From a paper:
We demonstrated that the TCR from the 1E6 T cell clone bound to HLA-A*0201–ALWGPDPAAA using a limited footprint and very weak binding affinity. Here, we solved the structure of the 1E6 TCR with 7 altered peptide ligands (APLs) determined by our previously published combinatorial peptide library (CPL) screening, 2 of which mapped within human pathogens. Concomitant with our global analysis of 1E6 TCR binding to the APLs, we observed a common interaction element, consistent with our previous findings, that utilized TCR residues Tyr97α and Trp97β, forming an aromatic cap over a central GPD motif that was present in all of the APLs. Ligand engagement is dominated by peptide interactions, but hotspot-like interactions with the central GPD motif enable the 1E6 TCR to tolerate peptide residues that vary outside of this region, explaining how T cells expressing this TCR may cross-react with a large number of different peptides.
We also solved the structure of each unligated APL to investigate whether structural changes occurred before or after binding — which, combined with an in-depth cellular and biophysical analysis of the 1E6 interaction with each APL, demonstrated the molecular mechanism mediating the high level of cross-reactivity exhibited by this preproinsulin-reactive human CD8+ T cell clone. The unligated structures of A2-AQWGPDAAA, A2-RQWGPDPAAV, A2-YQFGPDFPIA, and A2-RQFGPDFPTI were virtually identical when in complex with 1E6. Conversely, the stronger-affinity ligands A2-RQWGPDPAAV (KD = 7.8 μM), A2-YQFGPDFPIA (KD = 7.4 μM), and A2-RQFGPDFPTI (KD = 0.5 μM) exhibited favorable entropy (TΔS° = 2.2 to 14.9 kcal/mol), indicating an order-to-disorder change during binding, possibly through the expulsion of ordered water molecules. Furthermore, the structures of the unligated pMHCs demonstrated that, for these stronger-affinity ligands, there was less conformational difference between the TCR ligated pMHCs compared with the weaker-affinity ligands.
Numbering used by the authors:
A (entry chain C): 1 to 10
B (entry chain B): 0 to 99
C (entry chain A): 0 to 276
Write the structure that this text describes.
Amino acid sequence: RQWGPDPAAV
Amino acid sequence: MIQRTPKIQVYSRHPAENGKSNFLNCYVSGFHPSDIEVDLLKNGERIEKVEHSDLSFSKDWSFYLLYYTEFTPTEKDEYACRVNHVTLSQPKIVKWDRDM
Amino acid sequence: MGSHSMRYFFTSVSRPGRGEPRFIAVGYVDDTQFVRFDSDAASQRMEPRAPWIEQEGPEYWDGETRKVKAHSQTHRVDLGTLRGYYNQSEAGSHTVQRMYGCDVGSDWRFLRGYHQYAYDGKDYIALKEDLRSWTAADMAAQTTKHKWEAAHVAEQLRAYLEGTCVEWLRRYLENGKETLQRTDAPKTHMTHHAVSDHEATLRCWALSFYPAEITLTWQRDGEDQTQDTELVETRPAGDGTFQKWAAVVVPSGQEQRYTCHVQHEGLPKPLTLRWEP
């Protein structure tokens, strides 16, 4: 199961 | 940035026995960037039915892929893996040795 | 088996010529790949790569697809941001990589978590072991670190790594236990290759093993030897197992002094092989 909802942008 | 050239191993899934079906593998690793061209050859001719694994990478960020096809080794047929990458002037050909 | 991991790997490659970055995501439990996404594949879905994940229902696949597509868009943005941070031309292709995951230890509880990010194949930013602080490699990554600190990104990641990640790793380990919790000890043998009238090569083979972690060593009269040896990189067989070999050159007639020692999770005690066939 992935980390969500969405990684923070760099 | 870095360009790292691929390492190449050419080998069979199972111990090679002349006349018996098997799988021929070309494992390319340690490369960067990921764009790469890999063919398996039989007597110098490209094999069309070749498949490959999904792109992944190692602890040092370098990439690795397995290319493979079903084959039947014989005494006289020669197999090889041909690789092109930005780090190579010309494609690199590595002959399959059944003892390696 | 006695520690386990779940890891996700992501690669985005920009295409300055035309279109969006190439994006490839893969997930593993230990050394078993179980899901993929490829932005160039027709499905545009997260896809199964192991039989034991196929039983997850539609809500799972929808959620995992949504997450992975959002992630791809984030790397698309990142590739533009990074080109600006580094004052790079629009003309060249560049790469983002991310890996994150969690380990359970021998007690089946959380052991550690990690999250690492790279630009053009070099470290960029990484979560420290404490899951609270970041390591930034340079002043571009230091800009990201300040951003992520102010947005409490580490707290959100930590909750995942200690919670959901561990829980779902345990679920997969059980659902796939027939293979995931089976150790395949290496099938070992030795070959002998004359190099001259005076010397021979002994090659110690380890085949069809899982997991990939293995140690092959040679000893002469019971003492480790690395001179006159060669070891190949552990390699996939293509059926989910791995292969390796180690070789030593020896004086013809003295083969029996040499022993190959094989350590692997599937072996209760290390094996010792000796040329005396």
